[PDB]
PDB file of all heavy atoms in Angstrom:
ATOM      1  N   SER A   5      -3.804   6.631  -5.197  1.00 47.23           N
ATOM      2  CA  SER A   5      -5.039   5.860  -5.277  1.00 47.23           C
ATOM      3  C   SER A   5      -6.257   6.771  -5.151  1.00 47.23           C
ATOM      4  O   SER A   5      -7.107   6.572  -4.283  1.00 47.23           O
ATOM      5  CB  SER A   5      -5.071   4.793  -4.182  1.00 47.23           C
ATOM      6  OG  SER A   5      -3.776   4.270  -3.941  1.00 47.23           O
ATOM      7  N   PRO A  18       0.169   4.069 -26.420  1.00 42.22           N
ATOM      8  CA  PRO A  18       0.668   5.330 -25.861  1.00 42.22           C
ATOM      9  C   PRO A  18       2.136   5.243 -25.457  1.00 42.22           C
ATOM     10  O   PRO A  18       2.456   5.040 -24.287  1.00 42.22           O
ATOM     11  CB  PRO A  18      -0.213   5.545 -24.628  1.00 42.22           C
ATOM     12  CG  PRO A  18      -0.660   4.178 -24.239  1.00 42.22           C
ATOM     13  CD  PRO A  18      -0.788   3.404 -25.521  1.00 42.22           C
ATOM     14  N   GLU A  19       3.024   5.402 -26.434  1.00 43.45           N
ATOM     15  CA  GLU A  19       4.459   5.342 -26.179  1.00 43.45           C
ATOM     16  C   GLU A  19       5.102   6.713 -26.364  1.00 43.45           C
ATOM     17  O   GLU A  19       5.482   7.090 -27.474  1.00 43.45           O
ATOM     18  CB  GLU A  19       5.122   4.324 -27.110  1.00 43.45           C
ATOM     19  CG  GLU A  19       6.593   4.092 -26.807  1.00 43.45           C
ATOM     20  CD  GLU A  19       7.157   2.893 -27.544  1.00 43.45           C
ATOM     21  OE1 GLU A  19       6.418   2.289 -28.349  1.00 43.45           O
ATOM     22  OE2 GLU A  19       8.339   2.560 -27.317  1.00 43.45           O
ATOM     23  N   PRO A  28      -1.750  -3.660 -20.953  1.00 41.74           N
ATOM     24  CA  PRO A  28      -3.123  -4.054 -21.283  1.00 41.74           C
ATOM     25  C   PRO A  28      -3.800  -4.805 -20.141  1.00 41.74           C
ATOM     26  O   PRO A  28      -3.337  -5.865 -19.721  1.00 41.74           O
ATOM     27  CB  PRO A  28      -2.948  -4.972 -22.496  1.00 41.74           C
ATOM     28  CG  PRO A  28      -1.564  -5.511 -22.365  1.00 41.74           C
ATOM     29  CD  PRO A  28      -0.753  -4.419 -21.726  1.00 41.74           C
ATOM     30  N   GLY A  29      -4.901  -4.249 -19.644  1.00 37.88           N
ATOM     31  CA  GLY A  29      -5.623  -4.881 -18.554  1.00 37.88           C
ATOM     32  C   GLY A  29      -5.172  -4.386 -17.195  1.00 37.88           C
ATOM     33  O   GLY A  29      -5.375  -5.058 -16.184  1.00 37.88           O
ATOM     34  N   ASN A  30      -4.556  -3.209 -17.170  1.00 41.20           N
ATOM     35  CA  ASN A  30      -4.072  -2.626 -15.923  1.00 41.20           C
ATOM     36  C   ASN A  30      -5.086  -1.636 -15.356  1.00 41.20           C
ATOM     37  O   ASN A  30      -5.943  -1.128 -16.079  1.00 41.20           O
ATOM     38  CB  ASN A  30      -2.731  -1.926 -16.150  1.00 41.20           C
ATOM     39  CG  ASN A  30      -1.558  -2.885 -16.079  1.00 41.20           C
ATOM     40  OD1 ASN A  30      -0.544  -2.596 -15.443  1.00 41.20           O
ATOM     41  ND2 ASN A  30      -1.693  -4.034 -16.730  1.00 41.20           N
ATOM     42  N   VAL A  32      -5.959   1.964 -13.711  1.00 39.59           N
ATOM     43  CA  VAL A  32      -5.465   3.333 -13.630  1.00 39.59           C
ATOM     44  C   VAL A  32      -6.555   4.283 -13.144  1.00 39.59           C
ATOM     45  O   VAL A  32      -7.687   4.244 -13.625  1.00 39.59           O
ATOM     46  CB  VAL A  32      -4.944   3.824 -14.994  1.00 39.59           C
ATOM     47  CG1 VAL A  32      -3.713   3.034 -15.411  1.00 39.59           C
ATOM     48  CG2 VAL A  32      -6.035   3.722 -16.049  1.00 39.59           C
ATOM     49  N   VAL A  34      -8.366   7.589 -13.109  1.00 33.76           N
ATOM     50  CA  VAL A  34      -8.554   8.760 -13.957  1.00 33.76           C
ATOM     51  C   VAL A  34      -8.767  10.016 -13.121  1.00 33.76           C
ATOM     52  O   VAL A  34      -9.664  10.070 -12.278  1.00 33.76           O
ATOM     53  CB  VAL A  34      -9.754   8.578 -14.906  1.00 33.76           C
ATOM     54  CG1 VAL A  34      -9.936   9.810 -15.778  1.00 33.76           C
ATOM     55  CG2 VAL A  34      -9.574   7.332 -15.759  1.00 33.76           C
ATOM     56  N   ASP A  40     -10.048  16.458 -25.819  1.00 34.45           N
ATOM     57  CA  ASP A  40      -8.991  16.332 -26.817  1.00 34.45           C
ATOM     58  C   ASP A  40      -8.553  14.879 -26.963  1.00 34.45           C
ATOM     59  O   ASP A  40      -7.417  14.598 -27.342  1.00 34.45           O
ATOM     60  CB  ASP A  40      -7.793  17.203 -26.433  1.00 34.45           C
ATOM     61  CG  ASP A  40      -7.957  18.643 -26.878  1.00 34.45           C
ATOM     62  OD1 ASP A  40      -8.095  18.875 -28.098  1.00 34.45           O
ATOM     63  OD2 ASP A  40      -7.948  19.539 -26.008  1.00 34.45           O
ATOM     64  N   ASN A  48       1.208   4.116 -10.017  1.00 34.27           N
ATOM     65  CA  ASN A  48       2.405   4.047  -9.187  1.00 34.27           C
ATOM     66  C   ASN A  48       2.943   5.444  -8.892  1.00 34.27           C
ATOM     67  O   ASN A  48       4.144   5.629  -8.698  1.00 34.27           O
ATOM     68  CB  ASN A  48       3.482   3.209  -9.878  1.00 34.27           C
ATOM     69  CG  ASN A  48       4.441   2.572  -8.891  1.00 34.27           C
ATOM     70  OD1 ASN A  48       5.507   3.116  -8.604  1.00 34.27           O
ATOM     71  ND2 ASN A  48       4.064   1.412  -8.366  1.00 34.27           N
ATOM     72  N   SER A  67     -23.045   1.887  -5.773  1.00 40.50           N
ATOM     73  CA  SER A  67     -23.468   2.775  -6.849  1.00 40.50           C
ATOM     74  C   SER A  67     -24.919   3.204  -6.660  1.00 40.50           C
ATOM     75  O   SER A  67     -25.598   2.753  -5.738  1.00 40.50           O
ATOM     76  CB  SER A  67     -23.300   2.086  -8.204  1.00 40.50           C
ATOM     77  OG  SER A  67     -24.280   1.079  -8.388  1.00 40.50           O
TER      78      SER A  67
END
Side-chain angles (χ1 to χ4, degrees):
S5 325
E19 186 168 4
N30 276 225
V32 294
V34 180
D40 276 300
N48 206 265
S67 73

